[PDB]
Design a protein around this ligand. Structure first.
Ligand SMILES: NC(=O)C1=CN([C@@H]2O[C@H](COP(=O)(O)OP(=O)(O)OC[C@H]3O[C@@H](n4cnc5c(N)ncnc54)[C@H](OP(=O)(O)O)[C@@H]3O)[C@@H](O)[C@H]2O)C=CC1
Ligand SMILES: [Zn+2]
Lengths: 146, 342, 135, 114, 126, 207, 96, 84
């Protein structure tokens, strides 16, 4: 039902600031030239990028390659994962290694700091399917929810 | 950009270009090519016409449905212009004429009309105004048309300082008055030229290149407020040009010299025609006026056009004049024209 | 501001909590002068003195394979079996928990309908919130 | 790897046929720029012939080559005879098709097409 | 007229009048169309389909209709198997990304489970 | 007896089946998968090497005088490796019976012409060539028949778009009719109409 | 009704009108914009509620085979009024 | 030098990549203790030839195969990368 947002508050044209500091409409050539100049005059640790959540791997890798070619590695996300320890060096540390279909084989499940209902429903729906058929026993370290 | 002006498509008859043009003078030799090149890439063309609706048919097909919007106007009525430029983002004044009328003077078409069009385009929010002056235009020329044209571009720029002014040379095409004229002299069995054609230089350009240049200046952001000189790649002497003409026409070329003080009288006589005259004193003086040298002015190669030499596009104009004996004769049979630098 | 594309407007690889790379497909084109993001960035590079090698999408995905080859195995999940080492390593940080009761941000459904921009720009999700909060 | 041959049991005989066809076209171009009153030279026509021939230079299967030669002979017939007018001949030159650039960046500025 | 040794991969592009554009710049999709969840019919989940990449569609200024410069916008071909589609694509010179067929998994089902003494299958909605 | 259904007679079925056995055992070298339909129609499928012999036998033989070539068609089935199903529908005035002969071809697998048998096939084979791309042998004048004089493609191939790749118009610049890539003001609307519920269980394809 | 916009263009019953800055209004220069002045919504609002003494009423429109398919409308909710889905006629339970 | 990342590619069940898994389990821990702030990425896939991508400053990447080695060749290649 949130496909109605793709029809509203959309960016359809490249914008840029005018002398007054207001956002005006311009071309691709002009804006990309501005950005290319600013990028030319900067180098590592003064450039930085940030991803938002609806981004695709292609844009991520392209921006990483760009920033790398200008020596920056401050590529960051908005979501906080701890690099303390193994961090992103190992996928085992930031994945669902017991894949969603693994909740059907499980006997006990322990939820920590999650409301999987509002956060990943289909996962909560799978947990309920198991709770129904395979007599799964759930536990939760967190705030009490339904 | 307004949501309905964003260009969409591949640049075809049914695509969108983002161009909403008002072309004054579309019913002429050059306006038809301009409108063709505009409706070919999917732009809206507003074509104000004073003529009969039977003389816009050749235009009615060179644009997809709704891309061409016709309008009845009058140069004297100023509202007739506001209603036309009321919605455009470009205006292209091609208005001109090679002779004066009972009701219009060179001044009227070359100075006042452009000036009013420019006033209205400025007052109406237009971003671009393309004006078409002449290359040889000057406030010190023997011809009256060129003086008037220079005055007109001065006024257009004093009323619309960001006005793209385009200054072409003698244009040649199918429906022209330059190559067809130099071919139709034959009806008088000989070619009268001043100084025997020498001392005069001509740098003519194909009309399709001019139309491409206009249509590209419509959306070229480095061209605002600039002047251009649309000229062909090769310069010729009137003698060799007309000889090459009669070569493509395969007619007999009998040139003889003629001073200008009697050729202009001939032109006056011919201009007394209440219909479209075959020649005029001003057309005479416009001929035999040498061609200015590029003199640093920007041009077609700066708009994005590679000029087409006359030796490739002359036969499609001059095969209509040949006889059955010479129709099929190829292009290579004619010896090309001498090129000069001067 | 460089207007990009949405998930209904481009082809893109998105990876889920498991590592299952899944590809989107184009149903619509971006509005107005909006464009694919990697396209924007490659054009940006070309305009600068930089120039990224890839001009197409297959090349971008070959680059993906280079960096991480789990991003191209579509609909597949790759086993990973190196937790012992990560634990040996992470048993050496001297930080302790704060004892604050860790609670989730989405505590009820009125905190569920609007979480990203596509949702905050939806009149329908607003109708939903206005129904739930009212009763 | 075993199939039936149309005419040529190898690429060399197909090349012989292709050369015969090239000769025919090279000899015909002048007669049809004369007859059809085309407004081009004789060199442009032969350059266009060579370009249309190279357009399919990459082929290696003799059957594809044989069928291409058949199509070329069909067209050469349609042209030797005046069954086709100057319109269909000048279709080859694409005098009006705005030439799309091969520059990634221009293709980026105009449209979403790759 | 005996046999001949071709010993190469088939290529039909030069005989199909298809422009360089719509052969080099086209990504075909090969797949078994997914069941429509508004219906419980499974008869359109049998034959393999071939669908092309989607391209621009812009409103026509006059009326407001959808326009295209994509001839293959509505091209759909039907095959009985996956290898047939892959062969057709290779032959015609297209690039393809295949998608395996999704068959539902067999499911244990019992009407007694709805009535149980100790399990949670016990339903309260008869 | 029922007024909506169609009266069905088995006598014609038997006649055509017996004649099919006749043809099959008199031309074993070429015949494949003879078959007869619920509606009374005989279909004889063959190897293309047998085209001329089969058609000549069916024209000249005494118990088979199919000497009028009604139609000659092709059918693109991109699934099978040999797409084009060439069809020869024939008629016997002596027996007031029809028959259909079918072969198979490919983009690069031509067959032989039958103008030596039925002169009616000149234009039909030209049409097959123009529409599907099948090439015939020993054809007197094999050229295009229906398409434009410089048309690229074979439009009846399922892989060919209904609207084509080009589009014509008149350009005042060149003063000629020119061909430009297609661009439509309204795009053809593809309607998915197939019902998802099996409709004829007699034609069910076992998995 | 047919209300006009700041540009003078009339707003159709669909709520459609061109913005003052829209170039697409040249098609209406020296010409007119065809609108239907009889808005069906206002008209069907001007019609009255047909009371009935039965809890379930049918509506074929009028003329039988000249109207719309016969639908049956429930009229239990005394606050609301039942509206045909084809026509816009309203019905109310007289005795509630 | 200007080294920024080390990313290891390998398989989970294959002989050629057997040297990389042993290397990992035995020494990745110690090596990541020595260099704590240096990304050392392991993205194991299926039917992938094992490689070691070392990308230095200004986006310039190297690649040295590791097909059918022991853990010691892997260690020597990795330390050669580190040192430079
Ligand atoms: N050799 C050439 O063609 C050259 C042309 N130019 C410039 O190019 C422009 C056009 O050239 P060309 O097209 O050949 O000229 P044309 O005479 O071929 O057509 C000119 C246009 O001017 C319009 N026009 C003239 N006077 C009036 C008027 N009083 N009221 C309304 N409309 C009027 C005509 O409309 P209608 O015909 O319906 O009255 C006609 O469409 C001119 O401005 C000229 O200076 C520059 C250099 C050389
Ligand atoms: Zn009703």
């Amino acid at each position: 039902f949130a496909y109605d947002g793709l029809k509203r508050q959309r960016l359809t044209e490249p914008m840029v600031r005018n002398e007054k500091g207001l956002l005006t409409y311009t071309s691709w050539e002009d804006a990309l030239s501005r950005v290319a100049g600013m990028l030319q005059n900067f180098e590592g640790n003064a450039v930085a990028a940030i991803a938002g959540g609806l981004v695709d791997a292609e844009a991520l890798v392209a921006l990483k390659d760009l920033l790398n070619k200008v020596d920056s590695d401050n590529l960051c996300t908005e979501e906080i994962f701890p690099t303390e320890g193994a961090g992103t060096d190992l996928r085992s540390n930031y994945l669902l290694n017991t894949t969603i279909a693994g909740v059907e084989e499980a006997d006990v499940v322990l939820l920590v700091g999650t409301n999987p209902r509002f956060e990943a429903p289909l996962f909560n729906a799978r947990i309920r399917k198991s709770w129904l058929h395979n007599d799964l026993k759930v536990a939760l370290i967190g705030s009490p929810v339904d | 950009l307004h949501h309905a002006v964003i260009p969409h498509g591949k640049g075809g008859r049914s695509s969108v270009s983002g161009v909403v043009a008002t072309v004054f003078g579309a019913t002429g030799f050059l306006g038809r090519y301009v409108v063709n090149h505009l409706g070919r890439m999917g732009s809206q063309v507003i074509i104000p016409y004073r003529c009969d609706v039977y003389d816009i048919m050749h235009l009615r097909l060179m644009g997809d449905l709704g891309q061409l919007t016709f309008l009845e106007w009058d140069a004297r009525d100023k509202d007739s212009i506001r209603k036309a430029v009321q919605h455009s983002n470009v205006v292209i004044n091609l208005i001109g004429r090679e002779w004066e009328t009972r009701n219009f003077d060179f001044e009227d078409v070359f100075v006042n009309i452009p000036r009013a069009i420019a006033q209205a385009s400025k007052e109406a929010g237009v971003e671009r105004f393309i004006h078409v002056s002449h290359l040889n235009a000057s406030m010190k020329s023997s011809s009256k048309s060129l003086r008037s044209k220079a005055v007109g571009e001065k006024e257009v720029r004093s009323v619309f300082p960001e006005a793209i002014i385009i200054r072409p040379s003698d244009i040649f095409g199918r429906e022209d008055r330059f190559l067809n004229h130099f071919a139709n002299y034959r009806w008088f069995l000989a070619v009268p030229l001043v100084s025997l054609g020498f001392k005069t230089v001509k740098q003519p350009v194909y009309v399709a290149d001019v139309s491409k240049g206009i249509v590209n200046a419509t959306k070229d952001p480095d061209a605002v407020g600039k002047t251009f000189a649309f000229t062909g790649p090769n310069r010729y002497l009137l003698f060799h040009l007309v000889k090459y003409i009669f070569g493509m026409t395969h007619r007999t070329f009998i040139p003889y010299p003629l001073p200008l003080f009697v050729y202009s009288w001939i032109g006056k006589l011919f201009g007394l025609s209440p219909f479209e005259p075959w020649t005029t004193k001003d057309k005479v003086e416009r001929i035999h006026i040498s061609d200015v040298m590029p003199t640093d002015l920007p041009g077609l190669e700066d708009l994005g056009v590679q000029p087409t030499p006359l030796e490739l596009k002359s036969i499609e104009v001059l095969r209509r004049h040949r006889t059955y004996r010479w129709l099929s004769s190829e292009i290579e049979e004619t010896k090309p024209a001498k090129t000069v630098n001067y | 501001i460089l207007p990009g594309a949405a998930y209904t407007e481009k082809s893109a690889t998105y990876v889920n909590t498991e590592g299952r790379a899944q590809q989107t497909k184009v149903a619509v084109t971006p509005p107005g002068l909006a464009r694919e993001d990697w396209k924007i960035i490659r054009a940006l590079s070309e305009i600068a003195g930089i120039t990224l090698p890839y001009d197409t999408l297959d090349q971008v995905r070959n680059r993906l394979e280079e960096v991480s080859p789990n991003l191209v195995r579509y609909d597949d999940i790759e086993e990973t079996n190196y937790f012992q080492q990560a634990s040996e390593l992470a048993k050496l940080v001297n930080q302790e928990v704060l004892a604050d009761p860790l609670v989730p941000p989405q505590l009820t459904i009125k905190d569920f309908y609007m979480t990203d921009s596509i949702s905050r720009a939806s009149q329908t999700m607003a109708k939903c919130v206005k129904a739930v909060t009212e009763g | 790897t075993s199939v039936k041959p149309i005419f040529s049991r190898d690429l060399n005989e197909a090349k012989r046929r292709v050369r015969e066809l090239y000769r025919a076209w090279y000899r015909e171009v002048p007669n049809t720029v004369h007859l059809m009153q085309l407004d081009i030279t004789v060199k442009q026509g032969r350059d266009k012939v060579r370009e249309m021939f190279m357009k399919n230079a990459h082929v290696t299967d003799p059957r594809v080559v044989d069928l291409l030669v058949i199509k070329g002979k069909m067209e050469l017939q349609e042209t030797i005879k005046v069954w086709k007018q100057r319109t269909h001949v000048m279709r080859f030159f694409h005098e009006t098709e705005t030439p799309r650039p091969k520059d990634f960046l221009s293709k980026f500025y105009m449209g979403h097409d790759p | 007229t005996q046999l001949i040794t071709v010993d190469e991969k088939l290529d039909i592009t030069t005989l199909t009048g298809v422009p360089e554009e719509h052969i080099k710049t086209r990504k075909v999709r090969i797949f078994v169309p997914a069941r429509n969840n508004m219906q419980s019919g499974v008869n359109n989940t049998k034959k393999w389909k071939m669908e092309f990449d989607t391209r621009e569609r812009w409103e026509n200024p006059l009326m407001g209709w959808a326009s295209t410069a994509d001839p293959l916008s509505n091209m759909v071909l039907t095959f009985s198997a996956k290898e047939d589609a892959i062969a057709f694509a290779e032959k015609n010179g297209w690039s393809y990304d295949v998608e395996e067929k999704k068959v539902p998994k067999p499911k244990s089902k019992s009407y007694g489970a709805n009535f149980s003494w100790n399990k949670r299958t016990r339903v309260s909605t008869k | 007896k029922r007024p909506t259904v169609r009266p069905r007679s088995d006598v014609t079925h038997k006649q055509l089946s017996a004649f099919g056995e006749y043809v099959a055992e008199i031309l074993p070298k070429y015949v494949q998968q003879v078959q007869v339909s619920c509606l009374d129609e005989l279909e004889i499928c063959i190897h293309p090497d047998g085209v001329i012999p089969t058609l000549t036998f069916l024209r000249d033989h005494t118990n088979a005088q199919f000497k009028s070539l009604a139609d000659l068609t092709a059918v693109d089935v991109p699934t099978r490796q040999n797409r084009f199903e060439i069809v020869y529908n024939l008629l016997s005035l002596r027996f007031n019976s029809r028959i259909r002969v079918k072969t198979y071809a490919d983009e690069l697998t031509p067959i032989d012409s039958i103008v030596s048998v039925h002169i009616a096939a000149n234009w039909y084979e030209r049409e097959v060539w123009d529409m599907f791309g099948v090439f015939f042998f020993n054809h007197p004048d094999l050229r295009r028949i229906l398409t434009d004089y410089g048309f690229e493609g074979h439009p009846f191939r399922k892989d060919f778009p209904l609207t084509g790749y080009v589009e014509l118009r008149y350009d005042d610049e060149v003063k000629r009719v020119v061909a430009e890539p297609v661009e439509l003001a309204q795009e053809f609307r593809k309607f998915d109409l197939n019902s998802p519920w099996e409709a004829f269980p007699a034609y069910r394809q076992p998995p | 009704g047919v209300q006009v916009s700041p540009s003078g263009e009339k707003i159709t019953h669909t709520g459609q009108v061109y913005d003052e800055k829209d170039y697409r209004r040249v098609r209406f220069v020296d010409r007119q914009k065809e609108v239907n002045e009889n808005f069906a919504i206002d008209l069907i609002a001007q019609q009255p509620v047909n009371e009935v003494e039965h809890r379930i009423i049918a509506c074929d429109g009028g003329g039988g085979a000249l109207g719309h398919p016969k639908v049956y409308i429930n009229l239990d909710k005394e606050t609301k009024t039942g509206t045909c889905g084809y026509c816009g006629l309203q019905f109310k339970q007289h005795h509630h | 030098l200007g080294l920024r990342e080390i990313r290891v590619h390998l398989c989970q069940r294959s002989p050629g990549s057997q040297g990389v898994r042993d290397f990992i389990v035995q020494r990745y821990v110690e090596l990541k203790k020595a260099h704590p702030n240096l990304p050392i990425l392991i993205r194991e896939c299926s039917e992938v030839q094992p490689k070691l991508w070392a990308r230095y400053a200004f986006g310039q990447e190297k690649t040295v195969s590791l097909n059918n080695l022991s853990a010691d060749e892997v260690t020597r290649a990795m330390q050669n990368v580190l040192s430079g």
